[PDB]
Design a protein around this nucleic acid. Structure first.
Lengths: 145, 305, 48, 44
RNA sequence: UUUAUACUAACAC
RNA sequence: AUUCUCUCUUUGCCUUUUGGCUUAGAUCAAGUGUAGUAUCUGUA
Protein backbone atom coordinates (compact mmCIF):
# COMPACT_ATOMS: atom_id res chain seq x y z
CA UNK A 1 0.00 0.00 0.00
CA UNK A 2 1.18 3.51 -0.97
CA UNK A 3 -0.40 5.34 1.99
CA UNK A 4 3.12 6.07 3.28
CA UNK A 5 4.65 7.89 0.24
CA UNK A 6 3.42 11.29 1.41
CA UNK A 7 3.42 10.19 5.04
CA UNK A 8 7.15 9.51 5.31
CA UNK A 9 7.93 13.18 4.66
CA UNK A 10 6.23 14.68 7.71
CA UNK A 11 8.85 12.75 9.68
CA UNK A 12 11.75 13.89 7.50
CA UNK A 13 10.85 17.48 8.12
CA UNK A 14 10.21 16.99 11.82
CA UNK A 15 13.59 15.24 11.91
CA UNK A 16 15.25 18.23 10.29
CA UNK A 17 13.47 20.60 12.68
CA UNK A 18 14.57 18.36 15.50
CA UNK A 19 18.22 18.66 14.45
CA UNK A 20 18.23 22.46 14.29
CA UNK A 21 16.86 22.48 17.81
CA UNK A 22 19.33 19.77 18.93
CA UNK A 23 16.60 17.58 20.46
CA UNK A 24 17.26 13.90 19.71
CA UNK A 25 14.45 12.29 17.61
CA UNK A 26 13.63 8.86 18.91
CA UNK A 27 10.45 7.66 17.23
CA UNK A 28 8.14 4.75 18.20
CA UNK A 29 8.00 1.75 15.88
CA UNK A 30 8.78 2.77 12.34
CA UNK A 31 10.73 0.55 9.94
CA UNK A 32 14.49 0.62 10.68
CA UNK A 33 14.84 0.97 6.91
CA UNK A 34 12.87 4.24 6.90
CA UNK A 35 14.61 5.44 10.08
CA UNK A 36 17.79 5.48 8.04
CA UNK A 37 16.30 6.92 4.82
CA UNK A 38 15.55 9.89 6.98
CA UNK A 39 18.71 9.97 9.09
CA UNK A 40 20.62 10.04 5.77
CA UNK A 41 18.59 12.69 3.87
CA UNK A 42 18.74 14.83 6.94
CA UNK A 43 22.50 14.53 7.18
CA UNK A 44 22.73 15.91 3.67
CA UNK A 45 20.65 19.01 4.54
CA UNK A 46 22.74 19.59 7.66
CA UNK A 47 25.80 20.07 5.43
CA UNK A 48 24.43 22.43 2.80
CA UNK A 49 23.01 24.37 5.74
CA UNK A 50 26.23 24.44 7.75
CA UNK A 51 28.33 25.00 4.64
CA UNK A 52 26.42 28.17 3.95
CA UNK A 53 26.80 29.66 7.39
CA UNK A 54 30.53 29.33 6.70
CA UNK A 55 30.40 30.86 3.25
CA UNK A 56 28.30 33.88 4.29
CA UNK A 57 30.19 34.64 7.43
CA UNK A 58 33.05 35.10 5.05
CA UNK A 59 31.20 37.40 2.72
CA UNK A 60 30.51 39.58 5.73
CA UNK A 61 33.90 39.42 7.39
CA UNK A 62 35.03 40.78 4.04
CA UNK A 63 32.28 43.32 3.32
CA UNK A 64 30.47 42.19 0.15
CA UNK A 65 26.91 41.50 1.44
CA UNK A 66 24.31 43.83 2.90
CA UNK A 67 20.53 43.94 3.60
CA UNK A 68 19.63 42.61 7.01
CA UNK A 69 18.06 39.46 5.52
CA UNK A 70 21.46 37.86 4.95
CA UNK A 71 23.19 39.36 7.99
CA UNK A 72 20.05 38.35 9.90
CA UNK A 73 19.82 34.80 8.62
CA UNK A 74 23.47 33.96 8.85
CA UNK A 75 23.43 35.30 12.36
CA UNK A 76 20.73 32.81 13.26
CA UNK A 77 22.40 29.86 11.56
CA UNK A 78 25.48 30.61 13.63
CA UNK A 79 23.63 31.08 16.91
CA UNK A 80 22.30 27.53 16.45
CA UNK A 81 25.57 26.06 15.11
CA UNK A 82 27.18 27.44 18.24
CA UNK A 83 24.52 26.34 20.75
CA UNK A 84 24.79 22.86 19.25
CA UNK A 85 28.44 22.91 20.27
CA UNK A 86 28.02 24.54 23.69
CA UNK A 87 25.66 21.66 24.41
CA UNK A 88 28.33 19.03 23.67
CA UNK A 89 30.95 20.90 25.69
CA UNK A 90 28.64 20.51 28.70
CA UNK A 91 27.34 16.96 28.26
CA UNK A 92 30.91 15.84 27.44
CA UNK A 93 32.13 17.40 30.67
CA UNK A 94 29.91 15.44 33.08
CA UNK A 95 30.57 12.27 31.04
CA UNK A 96 34.33 12.90 30.83
CA UNK A 97 34.45 14.35 34.37
CA UNK A 98 36.43 17.31 35.79
CA UNK A 99 39.50 18.21 33.75
CA UNK A 100 41.23 19.97 36.64
CA UNK A 101 42.35 16.85 38.59
CA UNK A 102 42.36 17.29 42.40
CA UNK A 103 46.15 17.49 42.71
CA UNK A 104 46.16 20.53 40.42
CA UNK A 105 43.23 22.13 42.26
CA UNK A 106 44.90 21.46 45.62
CA UNK A 107 47.98 23.44 44.56
CA UNK A 108 45.91 26.27 43.06
CA UNK A 109 43.75 26.56 46.19
CA UNK A 110 46.64 26.32 48.68
CA UNK A 111 48.85 28.77 46.75
CA UNK A 112 45.88 31.14 46.66
CA UNK A 113 45.47 30.76 50.44
CA UNK A 114 49.11 31.79 50.98
CA UNK A 115 48.56 34.92 48.86
CA UNK A 116 45.52 36.05 50.88
CA UNK A 117 47.46 35.00 54.00
CA UNK A 118 50.39 37.24 52.99
CA UNK A 119 48.14 40.29 52.58
CA UNK A 120 46.58 40.02 56.06
CA UNK A 121 43.33 39.99 54.08
CA UNK A 122 39.94 40.37 55.77
CA UNK A 123 37.05 38.53 54.09
CA UNK A 124 33.99 40.48 52.92
CA UNK A 125 31.12 40.02 55.41
CA UNK A 126 27.37 39.83 54.87
CA UNK A 127 25.67 43.28 54.71
CA UNK A 128 24.84 44.51 58.23
CA UNK A 129 21.23 45.57 58.85
CA UNK A 130 22.52 48.91 60.15
CA UNK A 131 24.82 49.83 57.25
CA UNK A 132 25.35 53.51 56.39
CA UNK A 133 26.46 52.83 52.79
CA UNK A 134 23.64 50.56 51.49
CA UNK A 135 21.14 53.30 50.48
CA UNK A 136 23.91 54.91 48.42
CA UNK A 137 24.79 51.52 46.91
CA UNK A 138 21.23 50.72 45.83
CA UNK A 139 20.65 53.96 43.92
CA UNK A 140 23.82 53.30 41.92
CA UNK A 141 22.53 49.85 40.99
CA UNK A 142 19.26 51.24 39.62
CA UNK A 143 20.95 54.16 37.86
CA UNK A 144 22.97 51.51 36.02
CA UNK A 145 19.76 49.64 35.07
CA UNK B 1 -12.14 21.15 34.78
CA UNK B 2 -9.60 20.01 32.11
CA UNK B 3 -11.49 17.39 30.07
CA UNK B 4 -14.65 19.54 30.41
CA UNK B 5 -12.90 22.51 28.70
CA UNK B 6 -12.70 20.49 25.45
CA UNK B 7 -16.03 18.61 25.40
CA UNK B 8 -17.92 21.89 26.04
CA UNK B 9 -16.49 23.24 22.75
CA UNK B 10 -17.83 20.30 20.68
CA UNK B 11 -21.42 20.49 21.97
CA UNK B 12 -21.42 24.28 21.46
CA UNK B 13 -20.25 23.80 17.85
CA UNK B 14 -22.69 20.89 17.38
CA UNK B 15 -25.83 22.96 18.08
CA UNK B 16 -24.51 25.75 15.82
CA UNK B 17 -36.15 20.85 -5.82
CA UNK B 18 -35.95 21.14 -9.65
CA UNK B 19 -38.78 21.73 -12.16
CA UNK B 20 -39.26 21.84 -15.95
CA UNK B 21 -36.92 20.41 -18.60
CA UNK B 22 -35.01 23.68 -19.08
CA UNK B 23 -34.08 24.52 -15.46
CA UNK B 24 -32.66 21.01 -14.90
CA UNK B 25 -30.08 21.49 -17.68
CA UNK B 26 -28.78 24.58 -15.86
CA UNK B 27 -28.47 22.50 -12.69
CA UNK B 28 -26.97 19.63 -14.71
CA UNK B 29 -24.54 21.99 -16.47
CA UNK B 30 -23.12 23.59 -13.33
CA UNK B 31 -22.36 20.16 -11.84
CA UNK B 32 -20.39 19.44 -15.04
CA UNK B 33 -18.35 22.61 -14.49
CA UNK B 34 -17.74 21.51 -10.89
CA UNK B 35 -16.43 18.10 -11.99
CA UNK B 36 -14.31 19.39 -14.88
CA UNK B 37 -12.58 21.89 -12.59
CA UNK B 38 -11.62 19.21 -10.05
CA UNK B 39 -9.93 17.32 -12.90
CA UNK B 40 -7.86 20.37 -13.90
CA UNK B 41 -6.81 20.81 -10.26
CA UNK B 42 -5.65 17.16 -10.15
CA UNK B 43 -4.69 15.32 -13.37
CA UNK B 44 -4.58 12.10 -11.39
CA UNK B 45 -6.81 11.49 -8.35
CA UNK B 46 -9.15 8.68 -9.34
CA UNK B 47 -11.85 9.52 -6.76
CA UNK B 48 -12.72 12.62 -8.80
CA UNK B 49 -12.60 10.59 -12.03
CA UNK B 50 -14.65 7.55 -10.97
CA UNK B 51 -17.31 9.79 -9.43
CA UNK B 52 -17.65 11.80 -12.63
CA UNK B 53 -18.65 8.76 -14.70
CA UNK B 54 -21.11 7.25 -12.22
CA UNK B 55 -22.83 10.64 -12.10
CA UNK B 56 -23.30 10.76 -15.88
CA UNK B 57 -24.89 7.28 -16.26
CA UNK B 58 -27.62 7.99 -13.72
CA UNK B 59 -28.43 11.19 -15.63
CA UNK B 60 -27.81 10.21 -19.26
CA UNK B 61 -25.70 7.11 -20.08
CA UNK B 62 -23.33 6.40 -22.99
CA UNK B 63 -21.04 9.14 -24.41
CA UNK B 64 -20.36 11.45 -21.44
CA UNK B 65 -20.07 8.41 -19.19
CA UNK B 66 -18.22 6.09 -21.59
CA UNK B 67 -15.76 8.85 -22.61
CA UNK B 68 -14.85 9.94 -19.10
CA UNK B 69 -13.70 6.48 -17.99
CA UNK B 70 -11.76 6.09 -21.24
CA UNK B 71 -10.32 9.59 -20.75
CA UNK B 72 -9.33 8.78 -17.16
CA UNK B 73 -7.82 5.42 -18.20
CA UNK B 74 -5.28 7.35 -20.31
CA UNK B 75 -4.07 9.12 -17.15
CA UNK B 76 -3.49 5.81 -15.37
CA UNK B 77 -3.83 2.52 -17.27
CA UNK B 78 -2.98 0.24 -14.40
CA UNK B 79 -5.46 1.40 -11.81
CA UNK B 80 -7.60 -1.69 -11.22
CA UNK B 81 -10.38 0.10 -9.28
CA UNK B 82 -11.06 2.31 -12.32
CA UNK B 83 -11.05 -0.73 -14.64
CA UNK B 84 -13.77 -2.47 -12.60
CA UNK B 85 -15.92 0.61 -11.90
CA UNK B 86 -15.99 1.19 -15.65
CA UNK B 87 -17.02 -2.44 -16.37
CA UNK B 88 -19.82 -2.59 -13.77
CA UNK B 89 -21.48 0.55 -15.14
CA UNK B 90 -21.94 -1.10 -18.55
CA UNK B 91 -23.57 -4.26 -17.25
CA UNK B 92 -25.87 -2.29 -14.93
CA UNK B 93 -27.41 -1.07 -18.22
CA UNK B 94 -26.90 -4.55 -19.72
CA UNK B 95 -24.69 -4.14 -22.83
CA UNK B 96 -22.47 -7.22 -22.50
CA UNK B 97 -20.96 -7.20 -26.00
CA UNK B 98 -19.70 -3.67 -25.19
CA UNK B 99 -17.90 -4.93 -22.08
CA UNK B 100 -16.50 -8.19 -23.48
CA UNK B 101 -14.14 -6.17 -25.70
CA UNK B 102 -13.23 -3.86 -22.83
CA UNK B 103 -12.58 -6.88 -20.61
CA UNK B 104 -10.22 -8.34 -23.20
CA UNK B 105 -8.27 -5.06 -23.41
CA UNK B 106 -7.37 -5.25 -19.72
CA UNK B 107 -6.49 -8.96 -19.78
CA UNK B 108 -4.02 -8.27 -22.61
CA UNK B 109 -2.78 -4.97 -21.18
CA UNK B 110 -1.89 -6.68 -17.89
CA UNK B 111 -1.73 -10.50 -17.50
CA UNK B 112 -0.76 -10.73 -13.81
CA UNK B 113 -3.93 -9.03 -12.56
CA UNK B 114 -5.75 -12.09 -11.26
CA UNK B 115 -8.76 -9.95 -10.27
CA UNK B 116 -9.36 -9.36 -13.99
CA UNK B 117 -9.05 -13.04 -14.94
CA UNK B 118 -11.55 -14.48 -12.45
CA UNK B 119 -13.91 -11.60 -13.19
CA UNK B 120 -13.58 -12.37 -16.90
CA UNK B 121 -15.10 -15.87 -16.61
CA UNK B 122 -17.64 -15.09 -13.84
CA UNK B 123 -19.40 -12.76 -16.27
CA UNK B 124 -19.28 -15.57 -18.78
CA UNK B 125 -21.30 -17.97 -16.65
CA UNK B 126 -24.11 -15.47 -16.11
CA UNK B 127 -23.88 -14.57 -19.79
CA UNK B 128 -24.21 -18.17 -20.88
CA UNK B 129 -22.05 -20.04 -23.31
CA UNK B 130 -19.42 -22.28 -21.74
CA UNK B 131 -17.21 -22.64 -24.84
CA UNK B 132 -16.29 -18.96 -24.47
CA UNK B 133 -15.15 -19.60 -20.87
CA UNK B 134 -12.71 -22.33 -21.93
CA UNK B 135 -10.98 -20.38 -24.74
CA UNK B 136 -10.61 -17.58 -22.16
CA UNK B 137 -9.47 -20.04 -19.47
CA UNK B 138 -7.08 -21.69 -21.92
CA UNK B 139 -5.25 -18.47 -22.80
CA UNK B 140 -4.78 -17.81 -19.07
CA UNK B 141 -2.92 -21.14 -18.83
CA UNK B 142 -0.45 -20.03 -21.55
CA UNK B 143 0.68 -17.49 -18.93
CA UNK B 144 0.70 -20.61 -16.72
CA UNK B 145 -0.18 -18.93 -13.46
CA UNK B 146 -1.01 -21.08 -10.42
CA UNK B 147 -3.09 -23.93 -9.04
CA UNK B 148 -5.98 -21.54 -8.30
CA UNK B 149 -6.08 -20.66 -11.99
CA UNK B 150 -6.25 -24.37 -12.87
CA UNK B 151 -8.70 -25.57 -10.24
CA UNK B 152 -11.21 -22.86 -11.16
CA UNK B 153 -10.79 -24.13 -14.73
CA UNK B 154 -11.58 -27.73 -13.66
CA UNK B 155 -14.56 -26.78 -11.43
CA UNK B 156 -16.14 -25.38 -14.60
CA UNK B 157 -15.61 -28.88 -16.05
CA UNK B 158 -17.23 -30.50 -12.97
CA UNK B 159 -20.26 -28.21 -12.50
CA UNK B 160 -21.09 -29.11 -16.08
CA UNK B 161 -20.33 -32.59 -17.41
CA UNK B 162 -17.87 -33.60 -20.21
CA UNK B 163 -15.39 -35.24 -17.87
CA UNK B 164 -12.85 -36.34 -20.53
CA UNK B 165 -11.69 -32.74 -21.09
CA UNK B 166 -11.34 -32.33 -17.31
CA UNK B 167 -8.94 -35.30 -17.17
CA UNK B 168 -6.72 -33.90 -19.95
CA UNK B 169 -6.74 -30.51 -18.23
CA UNK B 170 -5.60 -32.34 -15.08
CA UNK B 171 -2.73 -33.80 -17.13
CA UNK B 172 -1.57 -30.37 -18.31
CA UNK B 173 -1.51 -28.98 -14.74
CA UNK B 174 0.80 -31.89 -13.77
CA UNK B 175 3.33 -30.98 -16.48
CA UNK B 176 3.55 -27.27 -15.65
CA UNK B 177 3.58 -27.37 -11.84
CA UNK B 178 4.99 -30.86 -11.22
CA UNK B 179 4.69 -31.35 -7.45
CA UNK B 180 3.18 -34.08 -5.26
CA UNK B 181 -0.12 -32.44 -4.22
CA UNK B 182 -0.99 -32.07 -7.90
CA UNK B 183 -0.52 -35.82 -8.56
CA UNK B 184 -2.85 -36.80 -5.72
CA UNK B 185 -5.27 -34.11 -6.91
CA UNK B 186 -5.39 -36.05 -10.21
CA UNK B 187 -6.49 -39.28 -8.44
CA UNK B 188 -9.42 -37.44 -6.77
CA UNK B 189 -11.12 -37.21 -10.17
CA UNK B 190 -10.80 -40.95 -10.88
CA UNK B 191 -12.43 -41.63 -7.48
CA UNK B 192 -15.70 -39.92 -8.48
CA UNK B 193 -15.28 -41.31 -12.01
CA UNK B 194 -15.14 -44.79 -10.44
CA UNK B 195 -12.36 -46.33 -12.54
CA UNK B 196 -10.11 -48.35 -10.20
CA UNK B 197 -7.91 -49.50 -13.09
CA UNK B 198 -7.66 -45.90 -14.33
CA UNK B 199 -6.52 -44.74 -10.87
CA UNK B 200 -3.52 -47.07 -10.66
CA UNK B 201 -1.93 -46.05 -13.98
CA UNK B 202 -2.16 -42.38 -12.90
CA UNK B 203 -0.44 -43.21 -9.59
CA UNK B 204 2.12 -45.09 -11.71
CA UNK B 205 2.67 -42.02 -13.91
CA UNK B 206 3.49 -39.98 -10.78
CA UNK B 207 6.41 -42.26 -9.90
CA UNK B 208 7.82 -41.88 -13.44
CA UNK B 209 8.07 -38.08 -13.62
CA UNK B 210 9.08 -37.32 -10.00
CA UNK B 211 12.07 -39.54 -9.22
CA UNK B 212 13.64 -40.27 -5.84
CA UNK B 213 14.43 -36.69 -4.82
CA UNK B 214 11.03 -35.26 -5.80
CA UNK B 215 8.56 -37.66 -4.09
CA UNK B 216 7.12 -37.26 -0.57
CA UNK B 217 6.52 -39.78 2.19
CA UNK B 218 2.88 -38.59 2.06
CA UNK B 219 2.59 -39.90 -1.51
CA UNK B 220 2.75 -43.59 -0.52
CA UNK B 221 0.01 -43.40 2.14
CA UNK B 222 -2.21 -41.47 -0.30
CA UNK B 223 -1.59 -44.61 -2.38
CA UNK B 224 -2.36 -46.93 0.56
CA UNK B 225 -5.67 -45.25 1.52
CA UNK B 226 -7.01 -46.14 -1.94
CA UNK B 227 -6.19 -49.83 -1.25
CA UNK B 228 -8.39 -49.71 1.87
CA UNK B 229 -11.24 -48.51 -0.39
CA UNK B 230 -10.87 -51.63 -2.56
CA UNK B 231 -9.74 -53.78 0.40
CA UNK B 232 -7.05 -55.45 -1.72
CA UNK B 233 -4.52 -57.19 0.54
CA UNK B 234 -2.05 -58.02 -2.27
CA UNK B 235 -1.51 -54.38 -3.28
CA UNK B 236 -1.35 -53.01 0.27
CA UNK B 237 1.59 -55.05 1.63
CA UNK B 238 3.88 -54.75 -1.39
CA UNK B 239 3.35 -50.95 -1.61
CA UNK B 240 4.42 -50.37 2.01
CA UNK B 241 7.33 -52.82 1.76
CA UNK B 242 8.59 -51.01 -1.35
CA UNK B 243 7.89 -47.48 -0.06
CA UNK B 244 9.72 -47.88 3.28
CA UNK B 245 13.09 -48.27 1.54
CA UNK B 246 13.48 -44.77 -0.01
CA UNK B 247 12.81 -42.60 3.07
CA UNK B 248 14.75 -44.16 5.98
CA UNK B 249 15.71 -41.60 8.69
CA UNK B 250 14.13 -38.71 6.73
CA UNK B 251 10.48 -39.89 6.89
CA UNK B 252 10.41 -43.35 8.53
CA UNK B 253 8.23 -43.37 11.67
CA UNK B 254 5.12 -41.84 10.06
CA UNK B 255 5.01 -44.60 7.42
CA UNK B 256 5.52 -47.55 9.82
CA UNK B 257 2.50 -46.67 11.97
CA UNK B 258 0.34 -46.64 8.83
CA UNK B 259 1.72 -50.09 7.88
CA UNK B 260 0.67 -51.52 11.26
CA UNK B 261 -2.79 -49.88 11.00
CA UNK B 262 -3.27 -52.09 7.93
CA UNK B 263 -1.98 -55.21 9.73
CA UNK B 264 -4.46 -54.43 12.51
CA UNK B 265 -7.09 -55.10 9.86
CA UNK B 266 -5.26 -57.93 8.05
CA UNK B 267 0.99 -65.92 13.87
CA UNK B 268 1.10 -62.81 11.65
CA UNK B 269 2.35 -60.26 14.21
CA UNK B 270 5.97 -60.32 13.00
CA UNK B 271 6.05 -56.71 11.75
CA UNK B 272 4.30 -55.68 14.98
CA UNK B 273 7.64 -56.43 16.68
CA UNK B 274 9.75 -55.01 13.81
CA UNK B 275 7.84 -51.69 13.76
CA UNK B 276 8.06 -51.34 17.55
CA UNK B 277 11.75 -52.32 17.76
CA UNK B 278 12.67 -49.94 14.90
CA UNK B 279 10.74 -47.11 16.59
CA UNK B 280 12.42 -47.96 19.94
CA UNK B 281 15.91 -47.69 18.42
CA UNK B 282 14.65 -44.73 16.35
CA UNK B 283 14.04 -42.82 19.60
CA UNK B 284 17.06 -40.49 19.93
CA UNK B 285 19.23 -40.92 23.04
CA UNK B 286 21.67 -38.14 23.95
CA UNK B 287 23.86 -39.09 26.92
CA UNK B 288 24.82 -42.25 28.83
CA UNK B 289 21.74 -43.14 30.91
CA UNK B 290 19.38 -42.15 28.07
CA UNK B 291 21.05 -44.59 25.66
CA UNK B 292 21.25 -47.21 28.44
CA UNK B 293 17.53 -46.71 29.15
CA UNK B 294 16.84 -47.36 25.45
CA UNK B 295 19.07 -50.46 25.70
CA UNK B 296 16.60 -51.86 28.26
CA UNK B 297 13.69 -51.20 25.85
CA UNK B 298 15.07 -52.73 22.63
CA UNK B 299 16.65 -55.70 24.48
CA UNK B 300 13.26 -56.60 25.98
CA UNK B 301 11.82 -56.19 22.45
CA UNK B 302 14.56 -58.47 21.08
CA UNK B 303 14.07 -60.95 23.95
CA UNK B 304 10.30 -61.39 23.54
CA UNK B 305 10.66 -61.70 19.75
CA UNK C 1 -2.51 18.68 -25.58
CA UNK C 2 -4.01 15.54 -27.11
CA UNK C 3 -4.13 12.05 -25.56
CA UNK C 4 -1.08 9.72 -25.74
CA UNK C 5 -0.55 6.56 -27.83
CA UNK C 6 -2.44 3.72 -26.06
CA UNK C 7 -0.23 1.77 -23.66
CA UNK C 8 1.44 -1.65 -24.05
CA UNK C 9 1.27 -5.02 -22.22
CA UNK C 10 2.91 -4.91 -18.78
CA UNK C 11 4.39 -8.39 -18.65
CA UNK C 12 5.66 -8.34 -15.04
CA UNK C 13 7.32 -11.28 -13.27
CA UNK C 14 4.84 -13.16 -11.03
CA UNK C 15 3.82 -11.25 -7.88
CA UNK C 16 5.61 -12.51 -4.77
CA UNK C 17 3.79 -13.65 -1.63
CA UNK C 18 3.59 -11.01 1.11
CA UNK C 19 2.20 -12.39 4.43
CA UNK C 20 0.36 -10.44 7.15
CA UNK C 21 3.49 -10.00 9.30
CA UNK C 22 5.37 -8.28 6.46
CA UNK C 23 2.52 -5.85 5.73
CA UNK C 24 2.49 -5.06 9.48
CA UNK C 25 6.30 -4.60 9.60
CA UNK C 26 5.89 -1.67 7.15
CA UNK C 27 3.42 0.03 9.54
CA UNK C 28 4.10 3.77 9.51
CA UNK C 29 2.96 5.64 12.63
CA UNK C 30 1.65 9.07 11.73
CA UNK C 31 4.23 11.53 13.09
CA UNK C 32 3.18 14.57 15.06
CA UNK C 33 5.07 17.79 15.64
CA UNK C 34 6.42 19.68 18.57
CA UNK C 35 5.72 22.92 16.66
CA UNK C 36 3.82 22.71 13.38
CA UNK C 37 0.39 21.31 14.22
CA UNK C 38 -1.88 23.54 12.13
CA UNK C 39 -5.71 23.49 11.90
CA UNK C 40 -7.17 21.88 15.02
CA UNK C 41 -6.69 18.16 15.54
CA UNK C 42 -6.27 18.02 19.31
CA UNK C 43 -3.96 15.30 20.65
CA UNK C 44 -3.74 14.24 24.32
CA UNK C 45 -0.55 14.96 26.29
CA UNK C 46 0.11 11.22 26.82
CA UNK C 47 0.64 10.91 23.04
CA UNK C 48 3.59 13.35 23.03
CA UNK D 1 -0.93 33.31 41.88
CA UNK D 2 -1.84 30.46 39.47
CA UNK D 3 -5.27 29.02 40.31
CA UNK D 4 -6.94 25.87 38.98
CA UNK D 5 -8.82 27.66 36.16
CA UNK D 6 -5.49 28.70 34.64
CA UNK D 7 -3.84 25.24 34.60
CA UNK D 8 -6.83 23.41 33.12
CA UNK D 9 -6.85 25.69 30.06
CA UNK D 10 -3.04 25.48 29.83
CA UNK D 11 -3.21 21.67 29.71
CA UNK D 12 -5.84 22.00 26.99
CA UNK D 13 -3.63 24.59 25.26
CA UNK D 14 -0.51 22.42 25.04
CA UNK D 15 -2.61 19.54 23.70
CA UNK D 16 -3.81 21.97 21.03
CA UNK D 17 -0.68 23.73 19.81
CA UNK D 18 2.45 22.04 21.18
CA UNK D 19 4.93 22.87 23.94
CA UNK D 20 7.11 24.74 21.39
CA UNK D 21 4.70 27.69 21.02
CA UNK D 22 4.20 29.73 24.19
CA UNK D 23 3.04 33.23 23.26
CA UNK D 24 -0.04 31.77 21.55
CA UNK D 25 -0.97 30.31 24.93
CA UNK D 26 -0.15 33.42 27.01
CA UNK D 27 -2.60 35.41 24.84
CA UNK D 28 -5.46 33.07 25.74
CA UNK D 29 -4.46 33.24 29.45
CA UNK D 30 -4.66 37.08 29.43
CA UNK D 31 -2.68 37.93 32.62
CA UNK D 32 0.04 35.28 32.08
CA UNK D 33 3.23 35.92 30.04
CA UNK D 34 4.88 33.29 27.77
CA UNK D 35 7.88 33.07 30.12
CA UNK D 36 5.66 32.29 33.13
CA UNK D 37 3.29 30.17 31.01
CA UNK D 38 6.25 28.07 29.84
CA UNK D 39 8.17 28.23 33.15
CA UNK D 40 5.24 27.13 35.31
CA UNK D 41 4.77 24.23 32.86
CA UNK D 42 8.27 22.74 33.25
CA UNK D 43 7.98 22.97 37.04
CA UNK D 44 4.50 21.57 37.59
C1' U E 1 -35.91 54.08 29.26
C1' U E 2 -31.64 50.47 30.67
C1' U E 3 -27.60 46.59 29.49
C1' A E 4 -24.42 43.79 25.91
C1' U E 5 -22.40 42.76 20.87
C1' A E 6 -21.26 44.12 16.01
C1' C E 7 -21.70 47.32 12.22
C1' U E 8 -21.29 51.99 11.26
C1' A E 9 -14.77 54.20 11.07
C1' A E 10 -14.31 55.93 4.59
C1' C E 11 -13.87 59.80 12.89
C1' A E 12 -10.85 62.45 16.71
C1' C E 13 -7.28 63.04 20.46
C1' A F 1 -28.65 -27.37 2.32
C1' U F 2 -27.93 -22.45 -0.19
C1' U F 3 -28.83 -17.02 -0.91
C1' C F 4 -30.50 -11.99 0.97
C1' U F 5 -31.65 -8.51 5.18
C1' C F 6 -31.54 -7.17 10.56
C1' U F 7 -28.99 -7.55 15.69
C1' C F 8 -24.69 -8.72 18.98
C1' U F 9 -19.51 -10.34 20.05
C1' U F 10 -14.05 -10.66 18.33
C1' U F 11 -10.63 -9.15 14.55
C1' G F 12 -8.87 -6.18 9.74
C1' C F 13 -8.69 -1.35 6.40
C1' C F 14 -7.68 3.50 5.71
C1' U F 15 -7.84 9.97 4.65
C1' U F 16 -1.54 11.57 5.00
C1' U F 17 -2.77 15.46 10.18
C1' U F 18 -5.83 20.02 7.54
C1' G F 19 -0.90 21.35 0.84
C1' G F 20 5.23 22.97 0.78
C1' C F 21 10.10 26.55 2.38
C1' U F 22 12.60 30.06 5.35
C1' U F 23 15.77 34.13 10.82
C1' A F 24 10.50 28.96 15.96
C1' G F 25 9.51 33.40 8.59
C1' A F 26 8.78 38.03 12.39
C1' U F 27 7.06 40.96 16.59
C1' C F 28 3.54 41.58 21.72
C1' A F 29 -2.51 42.43 24.30
C1' A F 30 -3.13 50.36 28.16
C1' G F 31 -6.81 52.00 24.73
C1' U F 32 -10.63 55.13 25.98
C1' G F 33 -14.88 58.75 25.12
C1' U F 34 -19.05 60.57 22.33
C1' A F 35 -22.88 60.39 18.16
C1' G F 36 -26.00 57.36 14.67
C1' U F 37 -27.94 52.56 12.75
C1' A F 38 -29.14 47.00 13.31
C1' U F 39 -30.13 42.60 16.43
C1' C F 40 -31.17 40.28 21.35
C1' U F 41 -32.88 40.42 26.73
C1' G F 42 -35.80 42.73 30.86
C1' U F 43 -39.64 46.69 32.57
C1' A F 44 -78.86 11.55 21.43
Amino acid sequence: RQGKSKTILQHLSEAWRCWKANIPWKVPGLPAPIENMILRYVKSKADWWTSVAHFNRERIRRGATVDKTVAKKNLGRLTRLWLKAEQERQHNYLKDGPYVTADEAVAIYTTFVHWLESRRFQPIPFPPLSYKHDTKLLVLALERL
Amino acid sequence: XXXXXXXXXXXXXXXXNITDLEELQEFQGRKRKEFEDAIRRNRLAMGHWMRYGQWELDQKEFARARSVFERALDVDSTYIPLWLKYIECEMKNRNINHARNLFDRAVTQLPRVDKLWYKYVYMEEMLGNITGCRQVFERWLKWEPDENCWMSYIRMERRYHENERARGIYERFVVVHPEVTNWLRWARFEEECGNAANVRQVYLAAIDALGQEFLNERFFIAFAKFEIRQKEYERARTIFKYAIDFMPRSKSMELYKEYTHFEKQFXXXXXXXXXXXXXXXXXXXXXXXXXXXXXXXXXXXXXXX
Amino acid sequence: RGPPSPPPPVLHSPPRKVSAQEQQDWQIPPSISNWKNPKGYTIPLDKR
Amino acid sequence: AWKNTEDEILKAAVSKYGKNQWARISSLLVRKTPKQCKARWYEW
